[PDB]
Amino acid sequence: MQLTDFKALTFNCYGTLIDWETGIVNALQPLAKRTGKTFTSDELLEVFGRNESPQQTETPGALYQDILRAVYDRIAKEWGLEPDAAEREEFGTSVKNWPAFPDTVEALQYLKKHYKLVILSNIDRNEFKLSNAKLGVEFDHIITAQDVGSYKPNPNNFTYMIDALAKAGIEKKDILHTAESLYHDHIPANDAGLVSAWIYRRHGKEGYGATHVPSRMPNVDFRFNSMGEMAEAHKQALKG
Ligand SMILES: [Mg+2]
């Protein structure tokens, strides 16, 4: 089993390529100010993480800004605050400000020389374009929650991706699903019969951050602590 066995990398975006945690912590500051309390980053992220996937189940066909607006409402409710419409809009439209991790662009531009690069993301098509402009590559295929009609970890999101790649001549054995989220990505990738690369962005941190808690530890085939480390690994694997 090695990195060079695969023709395509399929990616989570938010949490693996885009640093959604910095974005979410930043975007929650006005609402948090209204509570009178100073939250830690992990507290802000974890209340997001207890709420985002439930919301995606609640409104599976919602565009991502509508998910985020409704997550704002859920967090306000946990905090005893009435939603403020303008504050909710500022939070819900914040993806435009969520930055790439500092290694992401360089790693993607390298890996784009060697793999078809594919997005399988909890996002809608137009919102993703804003993040794609921060990622520095053309993706060969982009599969969004909007395309599927549901959000990961729904198995249909994985089936849709696998089928789309098969039509482009990429067999399932050719795919390496590359992501941080045990819950959203690696558990359903196991169930879908995919090979997995775990990018453990939070390797030096507590808990799961913005990501929902996983029900079990899935089986992963590679672990790298960053995208740059996956790229460095490939540079050596390619010499084999
Ligand atoms: Mg509700």
CATH code, 49: 1.10.150.750
Same domain, 43 and 154: no
Same domain, 197 and 165: yes
Distance of CA 58 from the midpoint of ligand 1 (Å): 7
End-to-end CA distance of the chain: 13
Distance of CA 55 from the midpoint of ligand 1 (Å): 7
Q: Could you tell me which of 42, 57, 176, 78 has the C-alpha nearest to residue 185?
A: 176
**Coil, strand or helix: which one is 119?**
strand
Same domain, 114 and 223: yes
Whole-Å CA distances, 48 to 27, 210, 216? 11, 6, 20
Q: Could you tell me which of 74, 77, 75, 72 has the C-alpha nearest to residue 88?
A: 72
Distance of CA 106 from the midpoint of ligand 1 (Å): 40
In 50-201, alpha helices (H): 52-58, 64-78, 85-92, 104-111, 125-132, 145-148, 155-167, 187-191
Q: Could you tell me which of 227, 188, 230, 183 has the C-alpha nearest to residue 17?
A: 227
Distance of CA 54 from the midpoint of ligand 1 (Å): 9
Residue-number span of the structural domain to which 47 is assigned: 20-97
Domain end among 50, 73, 97: 97
Distance of CA 52 from the midpoint of ligand 1 (Å): 11
Distance of CA 94 from the midpoint of ligand 1 (Å): 21
Same domain, 68 and 180: no
Write down the experimental method used for this entry: X-ray
Distance of CA 69 from the midpoint of ligand 1 (Å): 11
The total domain count for the chain is 2
Distance of CA 89 from the midpoint of ligand 1 (Å): 17
Domain end among 39, 74, 97: 97
Distance of CA 240 from the midpoint of ligand 1 (Å): 53
Same domain, 31 and 86: yes
Using CA atoms in the order 50, 55, 60, 62, what is the torsion angle rounded to 10 degrees? -130
Distance of CA 82 from the midpoint of ligand 1 (Å): 14
Distance of CA 36 from the midpoint of ligand 1 (Å): 25
Domain end among 50, 81, 97: 97
